[PDB]
C-alpha cells in the first residue's frame, strides 16, 4: 500500500555518518508543515521518534505505528542506497 507520510533526507547523504537529518511531512492523511529532525541509525528507533512526534503535537497517539514505518522506510531506503 502507501503511507502518505513523506520522509526524505535533509542534508546530503555523506555515508559513514551515524546520524542523519530527515524531513517529514504529510500529503494524504488517509501544523500542516515540514518537520526536520536528526536520526541515529544504530541507536534510535523509528517508533521512538514517532512517539516523540506524538508527544509533541503532530499526529494522534494511535497514529504512531504509521509514522514510525514512514520513517523506517526512509531509514531502510537510505541504507539500501548505502548498499
Amino acid at each position: 500500500e502507501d503511507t502518505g507520510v513523506r520522509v526524505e533526507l535533509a542534508e546530503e547523504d555523506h555515508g559513514r555518518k551515524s546520524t542523519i537529518a530527515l524531513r517529514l511531512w504529510v500529503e494524504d492523511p488517509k501544523d500542516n508543515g515540514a518537520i526536520e529532525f536528526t536520526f541515529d541509525l544504530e541507536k534510535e528507533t523509528p517508533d521512538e521518534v514517532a512517539q516523540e512526534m506524538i508527544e509533541s503535537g503532530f499526529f494522534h497517539e494511535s497514529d504512531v505505528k504509521i509514522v514510525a514505518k514512514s520513517i523506517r522506510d526512509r531509514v531502510a531506503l537510505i541504507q539500501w542506497r548505502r548498499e
Binding site: 501544523d31 518537520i35 521518534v49 516523540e52
Partner: peptide, 17 residues
C-alpha cells in the same frame, strides 16, 4: 519557521516546504 522541543530533548524544526 519555529523550533519545537520535546520534553525528552529531541529538537524539531518546523518549516513550510
Amino acid at each position: 519557521l519555529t523550533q519545537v522541543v520535546h520534553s525528552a530533548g529531541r529538537r524539531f524544526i518546523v518549516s513550510p516546504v
